Design a protein around this ligand. Structure first.
Ligand SMILES: *C(=O)C[C@H]1C[C@@H](C)C(=O)/C=C/C(C)=C/[C@H](CO[C@@H]2O[C@H](C)[C@@H](O)[C@@H](OC)[C@H]2OC)[C@@H](CC)OC(=O)C[C@@H](O)[C@H](C)[C@H]1O[C@@H]1O[C@H](C)[C@@H](O[C@H]2C[C@@](C)(O)[C@@H](O)[C@H](C)O2)[C@H](N(C)C)[C@H]1O
Ligand SMILES: [Mg+2]
Ligand SMILES: [Mg+2]
Ligand SMILES: [Mg+2]
Ligand SMILES: [Mg+2]
Ligand SMILES: [Mg+2]
Ligand SMILES: [Mg+2]
Ligand SMILES: [Mg+2]
Ligand SMILES: [Mg+2]
Ligand SMILES: [Mg+2]
Ligand SMILES: [Mg+2]
Ligand SMILES: [Mg+2]
Ligand SMILES: [Mg+2]
Ligand SMILES: [Mg+2]
Ligand SMILES: [Mg+2]
Ligand SMILES: [Mg+2]
Ligand SMILES: [Mg+2]
Ligand SMILES: [Mg+2]
Ligand SMILES: [Mg+2]
Ligand SMILES: [Mg+2]
Ligand SMILES: [Mg+2]
Ligand SMILES: [Mg+2]
Ligand SMILES: [Mg+2]
Ligand SMILES: [Mg+2]
Ligand SMILES: [Mg+2]
Ligand SMILES: [Mg+2]
Ligand SMILES: [Mg+2]
Ligand SMILES: [Mg+2]
Ligand SMILES: [Mg+2]
Ligand SMILES: [Mg+2]
Ligand SMILES: [Mg+2]
Ligand SMILES: [Mg+2]
Ligand SMILES: [Mg+2]
Ligand SMILES: [Mg+2]
Ligand SMILES: [Mg+2]
Ligand SMILES: [Mg+2]
Ligand SMILES: [Mg+2]
Ligand SMILES: [Mg+2]
Ligand SMILES: [Mg+2]
Ligand SMILES: [Mg+2]
Ligand SMILES: [Mg+2]
Ligand SMILES: [Mg+2]
Ligand SMILES: [Mg+2]
Ligand SMILES: [Mg+2]
Ligand SMILES: [Mg+2]
Ligand SMILES: [Mg+2]
Ligand SMILES: [Mg+2]
Ligand SMILES: [Mg+2]
Ligand SMILES: [Mg+2]
Ligand SMILES: [Mg+2]
Ligand SMILES: [Mg+2]
Ligand SMILES: [Mg+2]
Ligand SMILES: [Mg+2]
Ligand SMILES: [Mg+2]
Ligand SMILES: [Mg+2]
Ligand SMILES: [Mg+2]
Ligand SMILES: [Mg+2]
Ligand SMILES: [Mg+2]
Ligand SMILES: [Mg+2]
Ligand SMILES: [Mg+2]
Ligand SMILES: [Mg+2]
Ligand SMILES: [Mg+2]
Ligand SMILES: [Mg+2]
Ligand SMILES: [Mg+2]
Ligand SMILES: [Mg+2]
Ligand SMILES: [Mg+2]
Ligand SMILES: [Mg+2]
Ligand SMILES: [Mg+2]
Ligand SMILES: [Mg+2]
Ligand SMILES: [Mg+2]
Ligand SMILES: [Mg+2]
Ligand SMILES: [Mg+2]
Ligand SMILES: [Mg+2]
Ligand SMILES: [Mg+2]
Ligand SMILES: [Mg+2]
Ligand SMILES: [Mg+2]
Ligand SMILES: [Mg+2]
Ligand SMILES: [Mg+2]
Ligand SMILES: [Mg+2]
Ligand SMILES: [Mg+2]
Ligand SMILES: [Mg+2]
Ligand SMILES: [Mg+2]
Ligand SMILES: [Mg+2]
Ligand SMILES: [Mg+2]
Ligand SMILES: [Mg+2]
Ligand SMILES: [Mg+2]
Ligand SMILES: [Mg+2]
Ligand SMILES: [Mg+2]
Ligand SMILES: [Mg+2]
Ligand SMILES: [Mg+2]
Ligand SMILES: [Mg+2]
Ligand SMILES: [Mg+2]
Ligand SMILES: [Mg+2]
Ligand SMILES: [Mg+2]
Ligand SMILES: [Mg+2]
Ligand SMILES: [Mg+2]
Ligand SMILES: [Mg+2]
Ligand SMILES: [Mg+2]
Ligand SMILES: [Mg+2]
Ligand SMILES: [Mg+2]
Ligand SMILES: [Mg+2]
Ligand SMILES: [Mg+2]
Ligand SMILES: [Mg+2]
Ligand SMILES: [Mg+2]
Ligand SMILES: [Mg+2]
Ligand SMILES: [Mg+2]
Ligand SMILES: [Mg+2]
Ligand SMILES: [Mg+2]
Ligand SMILES: [Mg+2]
Ligand SMILES: [Mg+2]
Ligand SMILES: [Mg+2]
Ligand SMILES: [Mg+2]
Ligand SMILES: [Mg+2]
Ligand SMILES: [Mg+2]
Ligand SMILES: [Mg+2]
Ligand SMILES: [Mg+2]
Ligand SMILES: [Mg+2]
Ligand SMILES: [Mg+2]
Ligand SMILES: [Mg+2]
Ligand SMILES: [Mg+2]
Ligand SMILES: [Mg+2]
Ligand SMILES: [Mg+2]
Ligand SMILES: [Mg+2]
Ligand SMILES: [Mg+2]
Ligand SMILES: [Mg+2]
Ligand SMILES: [Mg+2]
Ligand SMILES: [Mg+2]
Ligand SMILES: [Mg+2]
Ligand SMILES: [Mg+2]
Ligand SMILES: [Mg+2]
Ligand SMILES: [Mg+2]
Ligand SMILES: [Mg+2]
Ligand SMILES: [Mg+2]
Ligand SMILES: [Mg+2]
Ligand SMILES: [Mg+2]
Ligand SMILES: [Mg+2]
Ligand SMILES: [Mg+2]
Ligand SMILES: [Mg+2]
Ligand SMILES: [Mg+2]
Ligand SMILES: [Mg+2]
Ligand SMILES: [Mg+2]
Ligand SMILES: [Mg+2]
Ligand SMILES: [Mg+2]
Ligand SMILES: [Mg+2]
Ligand SMILES: [Mg+2]
Ligand SMILES: [Mg+2]
Ligand SMILES: [Mg+2]
Ligand SMILES: [Mg+2]
Ligand SMILES: [Mg+2]
Ligand SMILES: [Mg+2]
Ligand SMILES: [Mg+2]
Ligand SMILES: [Mg+2]
Ligand SMILES: [Mg+2]
Ligand SMILES: [Mg+2]
Ligand SMILES: [Mg+2]
Ligand SMILES: [Mg+2]
Ligand SMILES: [Mg+2]
Ligand SMILES: [Mg+2]
Ligand SMILES: [Mg+2]
Ligand SMILES: [Mg+2]
Ligand SMILES: [Mg+2]
Ligand SMILES: [Mg+2]
Ligand SMILES: [Mg+2]
Ligand SMILES: [Mg+2]
Ligand SMILES: [Mg+2]
Ligand SMILES: [Mg+2]
Ligand SMILES: [Mg+2]
Ligand SMILES: [Mg+2]
Ligand SMILES: [Mg+2]
Ligand SMILES: [Mg+2]
Ligand SMILES: [Mg+2]
Ligand SMILES: [Mg+2]
Ligand SMILES: [Mg+2]
Ligand SMILES: [Mg+2]
Ligand SMILES: [Mg+2]
Ligand SMILES: [Mg+2]
Ligand SMILES: [Mg+2]
Ligand SMILES: [Mg+2]
Ligand SMILES: [Mg+2]
Ligand SMILES: [Mg+2]
Ligand SMILES: [Mg+2]
Ligand SMILES: [Mg+2]
Ligand SMILES: [Mg+2]
Ligand SMILES: [Mg+2]
Ligand SMILES: [Mg+2]
Ligand SMILES: [Mg+2]
Ligand SMILES: [Mg+2]
Ligand SMILES: [Mg+2]
Ligand SMILES: [Mg+2]
Ligand SMILES: [Mg+2]
Ligand SMILES: [Mg+2]
Ligand SMILES: [Mg+2]
Ligand SMILES: [Mg+2]
Ligand SMILES: [Mg+2]
Ligand SMILES: [Mg+2]
Ligand SMILES: [Mg+2]
Ligand SMILES: [Mg+2]
Ligand SMILES: [Mg+2]
Ligand SMILES: [Mg+2]
Ligand SMILES: [Mg+2]
Ligand SMILES: [Mg+2]
Ligand SMILES: [Mg+2]
Ligand SMILES: [Mg+2]
Ligand SMILES: [Mg+2]
Ligand SMILES: [Mg+2]
Ligand SMILES: [Mg+2]
Ligand SMILES: [Mg+2]
Ligand SMILES: [Mg+2]
Ligand SMILES: [Mg+2]
Ligand SMILES: [Mg+2]
Ligand SMILES: [Mg+2]
Ligand SMILES: [Mg+2]
Ligand SMILES: [Mg+2]
Ligand SMILES: [Mg+2]
Ligand SMILES: [Mg+2]
Ligand SMILES: [Mg+2]
Ligand SMILES: [Mg+2]
Ligand SMILES: [Mg+2]
Ligand SMILES: [Mg+2]
Ligand SMILES: [Mg+2]
Ligand SMILES: [Mg+2]
Ligand SMILES: [Mg+2]
Ligand SMILES: [Mg+2]
Ligand SMILES: [Mg+2]
Ligand SMILES: [Mg+2]
Ligand SMILES: [Mg+2]
Ligand SMILES: [Mg+2]
Ligand SMILES: [Mg+2]
Ligand SMILES: [Mg+2]
Ligand SMILES: [Mg+2]
Ligand SMILES: [Mg+2]
Ligand SMILES: [Mg+2]
Ligand SMILES: [Mg+2]
Ligand SMILES: [Mg+2]
Ligand SMILES: [Mg+2]
Ligand SMILES: [Mg+2]
Ligand SMILES: [Mg+2]
Ligand SMILES: [Mg+2]
Ligand SMILES: [Mg+2]
Ligand SMILES: [Mg+2]
Ligand SMILES: [Mg+2]
Ligand SMILES: [Mg+2]
Ligand SMILES: [Mg+2]
Ligand SMILES: [Mg+2]
Ligand SMILES: [Mg+2]
Ligand SMILES: [Mg+2]
Ligand SMILES: [Mg+2]
Lengths: 48, 275
RNA sequence: GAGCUAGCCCUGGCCAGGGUGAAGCUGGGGUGAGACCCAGUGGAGGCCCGAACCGGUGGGGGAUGCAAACCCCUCGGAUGA
RNA sequence: GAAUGCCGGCAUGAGUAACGAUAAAGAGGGUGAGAAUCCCUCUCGCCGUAAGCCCAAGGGUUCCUACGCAAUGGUCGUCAGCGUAGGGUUAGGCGGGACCUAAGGUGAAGCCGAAAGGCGUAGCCGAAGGGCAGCCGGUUAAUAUUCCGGCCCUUCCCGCAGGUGCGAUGGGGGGACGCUCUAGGCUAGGGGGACCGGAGCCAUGGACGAGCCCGGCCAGAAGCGCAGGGUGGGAGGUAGGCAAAUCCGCCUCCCAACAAGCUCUGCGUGGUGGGGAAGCCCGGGUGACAACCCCCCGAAGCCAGGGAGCCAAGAAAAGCCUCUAAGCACAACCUGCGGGAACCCGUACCGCAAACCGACACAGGUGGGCGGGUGCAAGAGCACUCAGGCGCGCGGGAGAACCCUCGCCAAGGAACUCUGCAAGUUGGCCCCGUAACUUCGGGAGAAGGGGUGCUCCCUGGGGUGAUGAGCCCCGGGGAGCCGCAGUGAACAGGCUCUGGCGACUGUUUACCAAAAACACAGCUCUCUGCGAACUCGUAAGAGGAGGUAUAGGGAGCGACGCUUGCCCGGUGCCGGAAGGUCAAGGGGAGGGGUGCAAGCCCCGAACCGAAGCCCCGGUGAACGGCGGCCGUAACUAUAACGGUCCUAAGGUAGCGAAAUUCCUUGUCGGGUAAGUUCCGACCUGCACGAAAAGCGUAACGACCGGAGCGCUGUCUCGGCGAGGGACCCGGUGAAAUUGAACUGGCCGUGAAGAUGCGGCCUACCCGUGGCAGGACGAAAAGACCCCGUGGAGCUUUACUGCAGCC
RNA sequence: CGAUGUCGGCUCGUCGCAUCCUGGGGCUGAAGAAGGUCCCAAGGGUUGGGCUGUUCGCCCAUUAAAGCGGCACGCGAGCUG
RNA sequence: UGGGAGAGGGUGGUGGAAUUCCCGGAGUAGCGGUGAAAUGCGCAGAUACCGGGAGGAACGCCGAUGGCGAAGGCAGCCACCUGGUCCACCCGUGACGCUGAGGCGCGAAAGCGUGGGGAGCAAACCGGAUUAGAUACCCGGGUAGUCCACGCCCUAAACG
RNA sequence: CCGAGGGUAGGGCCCGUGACUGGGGCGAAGUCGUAACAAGGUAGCUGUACCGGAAGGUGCGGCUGGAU
């Protein structure tokens, strides 16, 4: 049947993208957290 | 004169449709339409605030002239009478001798070709708008301003009307379509006659899909839900109300009055409604 | 977190073929005029049969599966909520 | 040494299940250390509204080539979507951007919020919508509307010429729109040709033929032709389109008006440029100076912004045109012509899938276009086939039980069983014919029956052309022929009678319930006068609604028909300016503390003082409720009638052993040989009953009862046969489970059901195919039950708060 | 209770005997035939259907007879539901 | 041809009396009702009185033993539309007549459907009396209906 | 070919019969009331409507075949 992951490059960037995260107090804590943890990627990769 | 159908489907049995006999023009005035943003009952938060709305036919909004004191003394010809999906009444296209064009809601008996005019000097004839104080007592009237220069608020639905009962100082007394007796200021405008398309109320929708066309999504009974949803939810099998009949939000819904206690317009309501 | 699912909003798309034959219109009849009857025309409908498409009724299989819901047969809707 | 402990390693089950669609393979020749599995050829089979082809998304080098085979590939591998390396994606016109707006998002103004932030007009952003200029062929191992060739075109800059009051984010026009049905004319696509071009072919009995086989086109500027779309012209007045306006709007006049004219698309032709088969020979080369012609069918596509009808009444903005404003009229715009200029990103490959989403090269899921031919009434259905693509990444044998999927069956024909569950039967089309009842539509495909192939002959009408021939679409009559059988294969209703429930089409528990549940048109009550009520929000602001009582919210009931009775004492709601009670506040009789005193400080009675409650009324389609005991008629029985107690009032009409009846398989009748079910009745209704509606109702139902006909492997009662497995051999090789095991029966015993204790009996060691009685077999720390001063959802006249409202 | 699946049916049996039939008997209020009752006897046999989920029971048509009980109300790693 | 009388019919207007209700004033201990009473209403200010307002229905005197119509039936007043009928004249047609199975139309009240309207009245219904009872008569209430529009029903002691 | 008739299927009329059910006629001396005949003690009758153990009552309109 139809499963749950239905990839969509625009959807992905508009929802979890860097700019979405910066626009919001909770989103900025996410970036602040993932930098402090030392994540190699702050934000999902999506080819645009 | 509502139109019937022969029973060639289950729903055609009872369905009735409007005669559309007064309509003389079947596409709207391009300079007077603008798109009607369908809401679905959702507010600026995105939340449903009015249940069971959505999914009806697309519509354009016809801009209606609810002031008419815009153009005191300038006659106009009744150019056509058209269908308006945003209201129950029909609308009339007016060609002012100005060159300006406007829609008003069409009173009963208004004829294509006649002239209407607005102002304190206007004849007491169907279609003419006057300040309330200048209309003789007894005259049946529609599209009545509630406050001066604020716009026609009362008696706009198909077939409705208000009647002038008397005068008292700066105020005339109207019998509204609800049978309420209220004082309305005399400088308020109103249009002689009753709204047309009085047969509107005898339309038998006929089937569920006909309600879907008007943007009415199915209404589910509280008794059909669960306690998390409604005061009437739950019970094994069917169940009487089991409490004073209530709304989804708990308030009682069989008699509980809800007009605000200390509202300033109470000094102007003379007598509450009827039947 | 509404890329699953539920509802709504905006903008596009899709629905083989066949069957039934409403209103109206025309002609004829009828009548004081009518209602109305007959024929033709017409092509209405949460109309009928049936693919795509959307479903998931009964049974059988499958049950460390091909599959964390599938497969075969059969069955519902298919211009409409 | 134990924690169903944790991490790791390795066992057992076991050479066991399995190796992922039953579309299918065989052989020859290559290559190579090695070949069922790679390459080539021939034969065979499978898809063909796809299992072929083209877009979009998603994926991200998987593309092409050389070299490889450790791992990946369910076997093998020399092969590969794998490893290494090198190569490969070319645009003014295709798509997106330098253009426009949609929902929505954002947001100078402004508004609101402890903070974070929430709103918000313009504006901005935002597309698969609007707008906008490229077609055909060739070429590469791999890109091509991109390179090349031919023929076309767009914008920007500059110049020349001609023309004009030029000029805009401003005004206007236009853009600009639904659904169903649909006209004319075309094109796509297709069928045929005794005509045209072609390498050839004559077989095995015949055929050298009006034979067979292959092919008979594509693109094209101007011009022209056909078919369509769009569009009135002039004058005068003018107060409207938030300045102006010669534009637009409104009024009057004349003229043109089934036209014309102007303009714009489609199609045809068109200089020109291309293409070009079978077969043979080695993707090529030939064929070939290839030929490129006629007839027919014909779109859902095109002309298009076409026409008609209908009601539910069907985006915006830019480009474009027109009007003017400042301004400027050495400018500027418009038209024609010339030269110049023309950027950024994508482009490989897969794309119904082995490259996307499903942990897998996973029988699942994935939007758009093309989708040939013949026959079957039609069609995208079905059968077979074209182009094209495949045989599904373990095989070889054997021919047991048993399982799956499939075929047939004597006589019987539902006797099966909870149930005809399942499987038969019926099955398309044409004609005849068709009942109760009905809301007059229907019920209806009711039921039931006849026909169906082929040949010859005569013949009607419609399309094309010309009226004819030919082609074509529907028929009509007559006479024959063959078989068991003519919708000869494939696809394609079993029917009737009678109940319950629900009017109906719809909706639902994604993944055990599709229903009688939900919804539904319709009915009623109730709230709401507009800054509505109501809803979301602290608010601002929204929705309601750019609506206004024929409207909007809430509730119940549920098409339609006939109806919906009595009770207002309790709860609710509504009304009530009196009275009672009533908080803060006012009032201050009278007290108290302290000070020498003035004073300062504290307590405080009467009395005035809201909503609410009390109290007085109303109200049922508001919550709800609608009796008991005893007697009585000239046979008996029964009780129309009476007595008395109680209530706020004692259940009406209609219906009833019911989706409700406990006693119950009530009693009687029907149907059956026989009927705890069914249907019809009766009424002592344990415990129906009138909008949690009552009683009916044509039509409808994958709902749930009961019966009959048809027909059957359901059954008596099984038999045989097919294939896929099971079995044997080669390759690859799991799993749950497992204290260890050298693991028999009986009768006893034991914590009460013993392989393991006692007594007796029986028993050589080890496997393979099978069956399921035991190992209180496995799985899941019982989902029932209880316990825990464990948890959570839900309720209310439980407690206590809070929002909200007064 | 860190799980002993729970009615009936179907299939497959096996056992007890307090015996339904068949075999052998005694008594009889046993004339015969047919019964009644008790004793011995478990070798074999003990039908098909209508109703109901039913066990049981009632009924139809037969029969020599249409037995009663146990085996975890025998038997769901055998099926049904 | 010339005239006449008439509640003949349909439509649109519109006038005054009265009842009810609401508002304002004045005023107080009862009102109402019957055979008699009670229920009911009234110090939360009723009845009775005045002024104001809303609304529905029916039209007093004239009015009669009257008039009109085919019957059912028709009554304030005004206008419009329209039928029947009678008299005068003796002008026109030239028996063109009578009746009339079927057919068609009209048809009091009640009743029905869909909207409206609703003052008074009032089936049902509730209460108070009466009574052996009183599902009646009498009293207090009271819903359909009575009214309007359109569509039905088609009955009658539709009788002279 | 037609054809007695037989068979299959579906209709129409009539007759008999049926649990139960509707009212009707009749029947020396049953139970309840007293509706009508007198102004029958509420004049009666009437079409219709609703209601009630029953005759009946009531509403609306009509008749005199009503008394004083
Ligand atoms: C309760 O549910 C426990 C369950 C056993 C556990 C281990 C379990 O969950 C087993 C599941 C199984 C075997 C699932 C099978 C597969 O189903 C399919 O799975 C795939 C992933 C899914 O995509 C679907 O495929 C399409 C899904 O299909 C549904 C499934 C196949 C049918 O099998 C089952 O469902 C079997 C399951 O019911 C199993 C037998 C259960 O064990 C029994 O549990 C019950 C509770 C217990 O009985 C109780 C009944 C009582 C309480 O009344 C009492 O009388 C008895 C004594 O206990 C029973 N046992 C007696 C203990 C267990 O055997
Ligand atoms: Mg899904
Ligand atoms: Mg998606
Ligand atoms: Mg995207
Ligand atoms: Mg996208
Ligand atoms: Mg997206
Ligand atoms: Mg976001
Ligand atoms: Mg982002
Ligand atoms: Mg912050
Ligand atoms: Mg910060
Ligand atoms: Mg890094
Ligand atoms: Mg990053
Ligand atoms: Mg992130
Ligand atoms: Mg109709
Ligand atoms: Mg009809
Ligand atoms: Mg109209
Ligand atoms: Mg516009
Ligand atoms: Mg809005
Ligand atoms: Mg918003
Ligand atoms: Mg709501
Ligand atoms: Mg809504
Ligand atoms: Mg409206
Ligand atoms: Mg309208
Ligand atoms: Mg006012
Ligand atoms: Mg209505
Ligand atoms: Mg609508
Ligand atoms: Mg509902
Ligand atoms: Mg419920
Ligand atoms: Mg529920
Ligand atoms: Mg919730
Ligand atoms: Mg709650
Ligand atoms: Mg609740
Ligand atoms: Mg409840
Ligand atoms: Mg309950
Ligand atoms: Mg419930
Ligand atoms: Mg219940
Ligand atoms: Mg429920
Ligand atoms: Mg209750
Ligand atoms: Mg409540
Ligand atoms: Mg409230
Ligand atoms: Mg009011
Ligand atoms: Mg979604
Ligand atoms: Mg999305
Ligand atoms: Mg369709
Ligand atoms: Mg079609
Ligand atoms: Mg047909
Ligand atoms: Mg026809
Ligand atoms: Mg027409
Ligand atoms: Mg349909
Ligand atoms: Mg059919
Ligand atoms: Mg089946
Ligand atoms: Mg399947
Ligand atoms: Mg199938
Ligand atoms: Mg169908
Ligand atoms: Mg269809
Ligand atoms: Mg449609
Ligand atoms: Mg230890
Ligand atoms: Mg473990
Ligand atoms: Mg542990
Ligand atoms: Mg571990
Ligand atoms: Mg571990
Ligand atoms: Mg380990
Ligand atoms: Mg390690
Ligand atoms: Mg290991
Ligand atoms: Mg091993
Ligand atoms: Mg084994
Ligand atoms: Mg396995
Ligand atoms: Mg497997
Ligand atoms: Mg596998
Ligand atoms: Mg298959
Ligand atoms: Mg071979
Ligand atoms: Mg081979
Ligand atoms: Mg090999
Ligand atoms: Mg090899
Ligand atoms: Mg192979
Ligand atoms: Mg090969
Ligand atoms: Mg060969
Ligand atoms: Mg094909
Ligand atoms: Mg390898
Ligand atoms: Mg290898
Ligand atoms: Mg290597
Ligand atoms: Mg491997
Ligand atoms: Mg694999
Ligand atoms: Mg090699
Ligand atoms: Mg490449
Ligand atoms: Mg180019
Ligand atoms: Mg630039
Ligand atoms: Mg954006
Ligand atoms: Mg675009
Ligand atoms: Mg483009
Ligand atoms: Mg081109
Ligand atoms: Mg190319
Ligand atoms: Mg110019
Ligand atoms: Mg337009
Ligand atoms: Mg528009
Ligand atoms: Mg559009
Ligand atoms: Mg339509
Ligand atoms: Mg072409
Ligand atoms: Mg063809
Ligand atoms: Mg001018
Ligand atoms: Mg001007
Ligand atoms: Mg060639
Ligand atoms: Mg050559
Ligand atoms: Mg199409
Ligand atoms: Mg078009
Ligand atoms: Mg806009
Ligand atoms: Mg200037
Ligand atoms: Mg100059
Ligand atoms: Mg640039
Ligand atoms: Mg490319
Ligand atoms: Mg697929
Ligand atoms: Mg596709
Ligand atoms: Mg592939
Ligand atoms: Mg594979
Ligand atoms: Mg796959
Ligand atoms: Mg095809
Ligand atoms: Mg072809
Ligand atoms: Mg066919
Ligand atoms: Mg197609
Ligand atoms: Mg294969
Ligand atoms: Mg396949
Ligand atoms: Mg395979
Ligand atoms: Mg073998
Ligand atoms: Mg198969
Ligand atoms: Mg055979
Ligand atoms: Mg047989
Ligand atoms: Mg049979
Ligand atoms: Mg038979
Ligand atoms: Mg049976
Ligand atoms: Mg059955
Ligand atoms: Mg069943
Ligand atoms: Mg068939
Ligand atoms: Mg019948
Ligand atoms: Mg019939
Ligand atoms: Mg029938
Ligand atoms: Mg019937
Ligand atoms: Mg009929
Ligand atoms: Mg038939
Ligand atoms: Mg037929
Ligand atoms: Mg024939
Ligand atoms: Mg033949
Ligand atoms: Mg023969
Ligand atoms: Mg069928
Ligand atoms: Mg239903
Ligand atoms: Mg249902
Ligand atoms: Mg029902
Ligand atoms: Mg119904
Ligand atoms: Mg319904
Ligand atoms: Mg449907
Ligand atoms: Mg579930
Ligand atoms: Mg489910
Ligand atoms: Mg689930
Ligand atoms: Mg269910
Ligand atoms: Mg269903
Ligand atoms: Mg439901
Ligand atoms: Mg329904
Ligand atoms: Mg109803
Ligand atoms: Mg209503
Ligand atoms: Mg709120
Ligand atoms: Mg705050
Ligand atoms: Mg708005
Ligand atoms: Mg419902
Ligand atoms: Mg009926
Ligand atoms: Mg009460
Ligand atoms: Mg009360
Ligand atoms: Mg009460
Ligand atoms: Mg109570
Ligand atoms: Mg009743
Ligand atoms: Mg009963
Ligand atoms: Mg019974
Ligand atoms: Mg019943
Ligand atoms: Mg009951
Ligand atoms: Mg019972
Ligand atoms: Mg029982
Ligand atoms: Mg019985
Ligand atoms: Mg019987
Ligand atoms: Mg049953
Ligand atoms: Mg009884
Ligand atoms: Mg209820
Ligand atoms: Mg109930
Ligand atoms: Mg029915
Ligand atoms: Mg259904
Ligand atoms: Mg169903
Ligand atoms: Mg049967
Ligand atoms: Mg068998
Ligand atoms: Mg076999
Ligand atoms: Mg061997
Ligand atoms: Mg091996
Ligand atoms: Mg391997
Ligand atoms: Mg050991
Ligand atoms: Mg050992
Ligand atoms: Mg052993
Ligand atoms: Mg042993
Ligand atoms: Mg023991
Ligand atoms: Mg033992
Ligand atoms: Mg042992
Ligand atoms: Mg030992
Ligand atoms: Mg021992
Ligand atoms: Mg031992
Ligand atoms: Mg021993
Ligand atoms: Mg032994
Ligand atoms: Mg073996
Ligand atoms: Mg074995
Ligand atoms: Mg075993
Ligand atoms: Mg065991
Ligand atoms: Mg155990
Ligand atoms: Mg066991
Ligand atoms: Mg635990
Ligand atoms: Mg436990
Ligand atoms: Mg558990
Ligand atoms: Mg559970
Ligand atoms: Mg317990
Ligand atoms: Mg406690
Ligand atoms: Mg404790
Ligand atoms: Mg607790
Ligand atoms: Mg709080
Ligand atoms: Mg236990
Ligand atoms: Mg365990
Ligand atoms: Mg266990
Ligand atoms: Mg059996
Ligand atoms: Mg024996
Ligand atoms: Mg038992
Ligand atoms: Mg029993
Ligand atoms: Mg014997
Ligand atoms: Mg036994
Ligand atoms: Mg027991
Ligand atoms: Mg027991
Ligand atoms: Mg047992
Ligand atoms: Mg058992
Ligand atoms: Mg089982
Ligand atoms: Mg069992
Ligand atoms: Mg077991
Ligand atoms: Mg077992
Ligand atoms: Mg076991
Ligand atoms: Mg069950
Ligand atoms: Mg008093
Ligand atoms: Mg006082
Ligand atoms: Mg009134
Ligand atoms: Mg007269
Ligand atoms: Mg004369
Ligand atoms: Mg009448
Ligand atoms: Mg007395
Ligand atoms: Mg014979
Ligand atoms: Mg009397
Ligand atoms: Mg008397
Ligand atoms: Mg009397
Ligand atoms: Mg009475």
């Amino acid at each position: 049947m139809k499963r749950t992951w239905q990839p969509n490059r625009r959807k992905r960037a508009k929802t979890h993208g860097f700019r979405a995260r910066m626009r919001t107090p909770g989103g900025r804590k996410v970036l602040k957290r993932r930098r402090q943890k030392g994540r190699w990627r702050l934000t999902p990769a999506v080819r645009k | 004169a509502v139109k019937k159908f022969k029973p060639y489907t289950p729903s055609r049995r009872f369905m009735t449709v409007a005669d559309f006999s007064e309509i003389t023009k079947t596409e709207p005035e391009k300079s007077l339409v603008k798109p009607l943003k369908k809401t679905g009952g959702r507010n600026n938060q995105g939340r449903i605030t009015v249940r069971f709305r959505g999914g009806g036919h697309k519509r354009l909004y016809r801009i209606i002239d609810f002031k008419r004191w815009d153009k005191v003394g300038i006659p106009a010809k009744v150019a056509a009478i058209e269908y308006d999906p945003n209201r129950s009444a029909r609308i009339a296209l007016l060609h002012y001798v100005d060159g300006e064009k406007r829609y008003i809601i069409a009173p009963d008996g208004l004829q294509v070709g006649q002239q209407v005019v607005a102002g304190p000097d206007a004849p007491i004839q169907v279609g003419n708008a006057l300040p309330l104080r200048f209309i003789p007592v007894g005259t049946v009237v529609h599209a009545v301003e509630l406050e001066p220069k604020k716009g026609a608020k009362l008696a706009r639905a198909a077939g409705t009307s208000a009647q002038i009962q008397g005068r008292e100082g700066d105020y005339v007394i109207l019998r509204l379509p609800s049978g309420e007796l209220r004082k309305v200021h005399g400088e308020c405008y109103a249009t002689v006659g009753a709204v047309g398309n009085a047969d509107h109320k005898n339309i038998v929708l006929g089937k569920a899909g006909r309600s879907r066309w008007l943007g009415r999504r199915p209404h589910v009974r509280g008794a059909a839900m669960n306690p998390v949803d409604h005061p009437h939810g739950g019970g094994e099998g069917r169940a009487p109300r089991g409490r004073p009949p209530a709304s989804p939000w708990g308030w009682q819904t069989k008699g509980l009055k809800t007009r605000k206690r200390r509202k300033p317009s109470s000094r102007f309501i003379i007598a509450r409604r009827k039947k």
